[PDB]
Amino acid sequence: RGQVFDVGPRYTNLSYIGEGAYGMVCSAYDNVNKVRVAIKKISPFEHQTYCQRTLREIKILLRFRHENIIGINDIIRAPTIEQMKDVYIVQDLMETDLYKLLKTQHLSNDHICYFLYQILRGLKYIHSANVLHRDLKPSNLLLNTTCDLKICDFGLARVADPDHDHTGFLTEYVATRWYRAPEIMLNSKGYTKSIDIWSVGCILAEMLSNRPIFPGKHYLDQLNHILGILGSPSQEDLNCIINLKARNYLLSLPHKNKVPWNRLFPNADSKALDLLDKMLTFNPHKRIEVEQALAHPYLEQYYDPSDEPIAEAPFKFDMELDDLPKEKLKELIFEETARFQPG
Ligand SMILES: O=c1ccoc2cc(O)cc(O)c12
Q: Which domains does the chain have, with CATH numbers?
A: 1-93+323-343 (3.30.200.20), 94-322 (1.10.510.10)
Distance between Cα 134 and ligand 1 center (Å): 19
The DSSP 8-state label assigned to residue 79 in this structure reads S
Helix (H) or strand (E) holding 329, with range, is helix 326-336
The closest-lying atom of ligand 1 relative to the alpha carbon of residue 93 is 12
Distance between Cα 18 and ligand 1 center (Å): 9
CA 216 centroid distance within chain: 19
Annotated ligand binding at 17? The verdict is yes
Helix 326-336 vs helix 48-63: crossing angle, to nearest 10: 30
Resolution (A): 1.4
Evaluate whether 11 touches 90 at the Cβ level (below 8 Å). Answer: yes
Beta strands (DSSP E) in 31-116 are: 35-42, 74-76, 87-92, 96-97
Closest CA to 199 of 138, 151, 118: 138
> Is the CB–ligand 1 distance for residue 25 below 6 Å?
yes
Residue 15 pairs in a beta bridge with 27
Q: 102: which residues sit within 8 A by CB, 6+ positions away?
A: 138, 206, 207, 210
Q: Is 152 left (phi over 0), alpha (psi -120 to 50) or beta?
A: beta
Alpha helices in 107-217 (DSSP H): 109-128, 194-209
Question: For residue 251, how many other CB atoms are within 10 A of its CB?
Answer: 12
135 annotated active-site: yes
> Is the CB–ligand 1 distance for residue 20 below 6 Å?
yes
> Is the CB–ligand 1 distance for residue 17 below 6 Å?
yes
Q: 244: which residues sit within 8 A by CB, 6+ positions away?
A: none
Which residue, by CA, sits nearest to atom 5 of ligand 1? 25
Task: Please tell me the distance from the alpha carbon of residue 184 to that of residue 172, in angstroms, as a whole number.
Answer: 9
Residue 36 pairs in a beta bridge with 29
Residue 76 pairs in a beta bridge with 88
The closest-lying atom of ligand 1 relative to the alpha carbon of residue 71 is 9
Evaluate whether 177 touches 216 at the Cβ level (below 8 Å). Answer: yes
Which residue, by CA, sits nearest to atom 2 of ligand 1? 94
Closest CA to 89 of 115, 124, 53: 53
Strand, helix or coil for residue 149: strand
Task: Please tell me the distance from the alpha carbon of residue 254 to that of residue 22, in angstroms, as a whole number.
Answer: 43
The active-site residue, picked from 135, 153, 196, 237, is 135
Question: For residue 28, how many other CB atoms are within 10 A of its CB?
Answer: 20
Closest CA to 282 of 238, 251, 218, 220: 238
